[PDB]
């Protein structure tokens, strides 16, 4: 795919970092939910 269209490195390099960061936020919201009911 790169031999034909090389920009795919950046297009598939992003959309990974994005997802990991957003996964961190999902977990942070769950722990803060436990903090809100407990506190």
């Amino acid at each position: 795919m790169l031999k034909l269209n090389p920009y795919a490195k950046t297009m598939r390099r992003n959309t990974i970092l994005r997802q990991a960061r957003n996964h961190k936020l999902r977990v942070e919201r769950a722990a803060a939910a436990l903090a809100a009911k407990s506190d």
């Binding site: 490195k9 950046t10 598939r12 390099r13 990974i16």
Partner: protein, 216 residues
């Protein structure tokens, strides 16, 4: 002159770096790193001296030759291959050695070797089964592990140790290896109740028992 450093950019996925080449020019620090710009042998004789040749052309040629072959690229050999392993099989787990003349027996795993074949030992005392190799593909993983972490089993044993030659007599060294691993493990298996009975016992199917259906 410089010792070889590791790859600077980490691996996220096979063949894709984490960082971009523009941050990389910096990290490598290219801003301050620009550049610009036998066959004949002499020998003595008891005459003169003879200048002999090495690697002389062959005295006979054959009647016809096969041609050259093309360069394929990705085909590494077996020694150099990477060796996989299932999640179930960790050292300690109990295996069902299904196929060989030692059929359906229950036996403890020690270690994957370089080749990828499994080191297995159905305690010779109990099962009458020595240190034997097997293959993963022909083996069931039970969920009944034990904490085998603390023994310093010898390094010397290996694939070439188990490799066939071409009568078989049992070596004293073989007897030592068996005895040496036994003295270490046997109390842990005799500590847990009924388990030595289970090990002496052999696995075997019977009526109304279907592998897909049941679970273990």
């Amino acid at each position: 002159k410089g010792k070889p450093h590791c790859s600077r950019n980490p691996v996220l996925v096979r063949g894709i770096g984490r960082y971009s080449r523009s941050a990389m020019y910096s990290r490598k620090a290219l801003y301050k790193r620009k550049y610009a710009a036998l066959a004949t042998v002499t020998k003595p004789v008891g005459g003169g001296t003879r200048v002999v040749k090495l690697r002389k052309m062959p005295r006979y040629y054959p009647t016809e030759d096969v041609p050259r072959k093309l360069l394929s690229h990705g085909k590494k050999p077996f020694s150099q291959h990477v060796r996989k392993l299932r999640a179930s099989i960790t050292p300690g787990t109990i295996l069902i050695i299904l196929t060989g003349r030692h059929r359906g027996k229950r036996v403890v795993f020690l270690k994957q070797l370089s080749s990828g074949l499994l080191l297995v030992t159905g305690p010779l005392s109990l099962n009458r089964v020595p240190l034997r190799r097997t293959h993963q593909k022909f083996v069931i993983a039970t969920s009944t592990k034990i904490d085998i972490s603390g023994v310093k089993i010898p390094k010397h044993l290996t694939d070439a140790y188990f490799k066939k030659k071409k009568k078989y007599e049992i070596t004293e060294q073989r007897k030592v290896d068996q005895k040496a691993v036994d003295s270490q493990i046997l109390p842990k298996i005799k500590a847990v109740p009924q388990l030595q009975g289970y090990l002496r016992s052999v696995f075997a199917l019977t009526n109304g028992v279907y592998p897909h259906k049941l679970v273990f």
